[PDB]
Scaffold this active site. Structure first.
Site, PDB file in Angstrom:
ATOM      1  N   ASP A   1       4.396   4.556  27.885  1.00  7.75           N
ATOM      2  CA  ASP A   1       4.127   5.444  29.000  1.00  7.75           C
ATOM      3  C   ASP A   1       2.629   5.500  29.296  1.00  7.75           C
ATOM      4  O   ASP A   1       2.076   6.553  29.611  1.00  7.75           O
ATOM      5  CB  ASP A   1       4.699   6.820  28.667  1.00  7.75           C
ATOM      6  CG  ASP A   1       4.617   7.794  29.818  1.00  7.75           C
ATOM      7  OD1 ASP A   1       4.615   7.354  30.991  1.00  7.75           O
ATOM      8  OD2 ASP A   1       4.568   9.016  29.533  1.00  7.75           O
TER       9      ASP A   1
ATOM     10  N   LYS B   1      -1.926  22.913  23.679  1.00  6.15           N
ATOM     11  CA  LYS B   1      -0.649  22.907  24.348  1.00  6.15           C
ATOM     12  C   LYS B   1       0.405  23.717  23.614  1.00  6.15           C
ATOM     13  O   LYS B   1       0.665  23.496  22.432  1.00  6.15           O
ATOM     14  CB  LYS B   1      -0.178  21.462  24.490  1.00  6.15           C
ATOM     15  CG  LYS B   1       1.066  21.253  25.326  1.00  6.15           C
ATOM     16  CD  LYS B   1       1.023  19.880  25.967  1.00  6.15           C
ATOM     17  CE  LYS B   1       0.271  18.871  25.114  1.00  6.15           C
ATOM     18  NZ  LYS B   1       1.112  17.713  24.680  1.00  6.15           N
TER      19      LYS B   1
ATOM     20  N   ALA C   1       5.916  22.063  33.023  1.00  6.73           N
ATOM     21  CA  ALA C   1       7.279  22.543  32.910  1.00  6.73           C
ATOM     22  C   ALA C   1       7.324  23.491  31.723  1.00  6.73           C
ATOM     23  O   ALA C   1       6.711  24.559  31.753  1.00  6.73           O
ATOM     24  CB  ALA C   1       8.228  21.368  32.692  1.00  6.73           C
TER      25      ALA C   1
ATOM     26  N   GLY D   1       6.072  22.913  28.699  1.00  8.76           N
ATOM     27  CA  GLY D   1       4.817  22.894  27.973  1.00  8.76           C
ATOM     28  C   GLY D   1       3.633  23.306  28.820  1.00  8.76           C
ATOM     29  O   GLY D   1       3.405  22.741  29.885  1.00  8.76           O
TER      30      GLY D   1
HETATM   31  C1  F29 Z   1      -9.141  15.661  29.996  1.00  8.34           C
HETATM   32  C2  F29 Z   1      -9.555  16.989  30.423  1.00  8.34           C
HETATM   33  C3  F29 Z   1      -9.281  18.233  29.728  1.00  8.34           C
HETATM   34  N1  F29 Z   1      -8.358  18.162  28.652  1.00  8.34           N
HETATM   35  N2  F29 Z   1      -8.847  17.711  27.323  1.00  8.34           N
HETATM   36  C4  F29 Z   1      -7.759  17.322  26.515  1.00  8.34           C
HETATM   37  N3  F29 Z   1      -7.880  16.721  25.243  1.00  8.34           N
HETATM   38  C5  F29 Z   1      -6.563  17.509  27.295  1.00  8.34           C
HETATM   39  C6  F29 Z   1      -5.221  17.038  26.967  1.00  8.34           C
HETATM   40  C7  F29 Z   1      -4.077  17.086  27.879  1.00  8.34           C
HETATM   41  C8  F29 Z   1      -2.739  16.621  27.505  1.00  8.34           C
HETATM   42  C9  F29 Z   1      -1.922  17.006  26.357  1.00  8.34           C
HETATM   43  C10 F29 Z   1      -2.149  17.864  25.199  1.00  8.34           C
HETATM   44  C11 F29 Z   1      -3.023  19.038  25.166  1.00  8.34           C
HETATM   45  C12 F29 Z   1      -3.251  19.828  23.970  1.00  8.34           C
HETATM   46  C13 F29 Z   1      -2.570  19.499  22.732  1.00  8.34           C
HETATM   47  C14 F29 Z   1      -1.661  18.370  22.730  1.00  8.34           C
HETATM   48  C15 F29 Z   1      -1.476  17.572  23.932  1.00  8.34           C
HETATM   49  N4  F29 Z   1      -0.649  16.395  26.424  1.00  8.34           N
HETATM   50  N5  F29 Z   1      -0.649  15.596  27.651  1.00  8.34           N
HETATM   51  C16 F29 Z   1       0.441  14.825  28.113  1.00  8.34           C
HETATM   52  C17 F29 Z   1       0.300  14.012  29.309  1.00  8.34           C
HETATM   53  C18 F29 Z   1      -1.004  14.019  29.966  1.00  8.34           C
HETATM   54  C19 F29 Z   1      -2.103  14.833  29.450  1.00  8.34           C
HETATM   55  C20 F29 Z   1      -1.914  15.687  28.272  1.00  8.34           C
HETATM   56  N6  F29 Z   1      -4.406  17.653  29.143  1.00  8.34           N
HETATM   57  N7  F29 Z   1      -5.876  18.171  29.504  1.00  8.34           N
HETATM   58  C21 F29 Z   1      -6.946  18.069  28.577  1.00  8.34           C
END
Ligand code: F29
EC number: 2.7.11.24
Length: 350
Positions: free
Chosen positions: A142, A47, A28, A30
């Site tokens: 959550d 993000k 959305a 973000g």
């Molecule tokens: C896990 C596979 C790739 N990847 N690696 C991460 N650390 C990652 C994180 C996420 C991610 C982030 C997030 C990303 C960057 C900065 C702060 C929060 N917030 N967030 C919230 C709900 C579900 C996943 C997710 N979504 N994909 C990602």
């Protein structure tokens, strides 16, 4: 040199330190993209968030950041960096940086086979992290397979704290069906009934759910939400006993469960043919209808199923627990921004 980059319309200005962007998720408002950190020799996830024009979004951001900066634990995602404007009026958005992981538990359930040793590993790591968050008097609120990130060596880390907060059991009661935007099925039954999810037991129920999905190698909670969903859960666990009904000190929620037809309990062992009995034991204790009778993290960790990983001396607790008053909105969007600004101050040179 560098400059504001593009992905799919929106502006992702994070270089020159981070380059080679790759879109990852809608989110959305973000947007998450992957990048490469040039100062350090590592890959990263970042993000872009742009709240500030809605008090509810500011809530989420402040929570994720504040909590995550306060925490420091192997099984909890750590914030590597935060890009934002030097002054408040210039600040329109926040770019959070983290270690690029590999994948999440939700994807693994839907595409890979989870063996016994792996399930035991994941469960242990999930509880170890949860133990620390609860020791800090924080409730995630959550937990789900998508909020559990993994790397290529199988190390797991909890991530999204947009709905997290200080426990507060004295105000857990809320009155029958009052809603609360979240969008899921891993949330505890009582939240629908007479609770606002202010006690530790809510996280445990969640973990129990992901343990079951791991055990059946698929999402157990797919369609059918709210009441329909609760009826299906009862069709598995069995109708709440009268003993259980005492906990519910509210006529509306109480009476609704009386309305339901008698459901027999369906033991987990008959549902999961080839599954470690110790794992089923833990499951049963984590997935109980009465939050009070529900097992706590300490107990879970020490349960026989995790016998090969259990080590109290290698399972740290908070260090800096808290109990603020910000809780439950009641705070202008402007002030939240101020607080968010101060909270990110440590990443700007100085
Ligand atoms: C896990 C596979 C790739 N990847 N690696 C991460 N650390 C990652 C994180 C996420 C991610 C982030 C997030 C990303 C960057 C900065 C702060 C929060 N917030 N967030 C919230 C709900 C579900 C996943 C997710 N979504 N994909 C990602």
């Amino acid at each position: 040199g560098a400059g504001p980059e593009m992905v799919r319309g929106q502006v992702f200005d994070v270089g020159p330190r981070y380059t080679n962007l790759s879109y990852i998720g809608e989110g959305a408002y973000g947007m998450v993209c992957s990048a490469y950190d040039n100062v350090n020799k590592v890959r990263v996830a970042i993000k872009k968030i742009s709240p500030f024009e809605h008090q509810t979004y500011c809530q989420r951001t402040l929570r994720e950041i504040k909590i995550l900066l306060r925490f420091r634990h192997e099984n909890i995602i750590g914030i590597n960096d935060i890009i934002r404007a030097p002054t408040i009026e210039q600040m329109k958005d926040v770019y959070i940086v983290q270690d690029l992981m590999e994948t999440d538990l939700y994807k693994l359930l839907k595409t890979q086979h989870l063996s016994n040793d792996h399930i035991c590993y994941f469960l242990y790591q999930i509880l170890r992290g949860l133990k620390y968050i609860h020791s800090a008097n924080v409730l995630h609120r959550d937990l789900k397979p998508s909020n559990l990130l993994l790397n290529t060596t199988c190390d797991l880390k909890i991530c999204d704290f947009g709905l997290a907060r200080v426990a507060d059991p004295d105000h857990d009661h809320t009155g029958f069906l009052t809603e609360y935007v979240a969008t899921r099925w891993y949330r505890a039954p009582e939240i629908m009934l007479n609770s606002k999810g202010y006690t530790k037991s809510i996280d445990i129920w969640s973990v129990g759910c992901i343990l079951a999905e791991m055990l059946s190698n698929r999402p157990i909670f797919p369609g059918k939400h709210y009441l329909d969903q609760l009826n299906h859960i009862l069709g598995i666990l069995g109708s709440p006993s009268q003993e259980d009904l005492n906990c519910i000190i509210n006529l509306k929620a109480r009476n609704y469960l009386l309305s339901l037809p008698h459901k027999n309990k369906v033991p987990w062992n008959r549902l999961f043919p080839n599954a470690d009995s110790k794992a089923l034991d833990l499951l049963d204790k984590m997935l109980t209808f009465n939050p009070h009778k529900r097992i706590e993290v300490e107990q879970a960790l020490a349960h026989p199923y995790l016998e090969q990983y259990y080590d109290p001396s290698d399972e740290p607790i908070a260090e800096a627990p808290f109990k603020f008053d910000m809780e439950l909105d009641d705070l202008p969007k402007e002030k939240l921004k101020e607080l968010i600004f101060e909270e990110t101050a440590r990443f700007q040179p100085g």
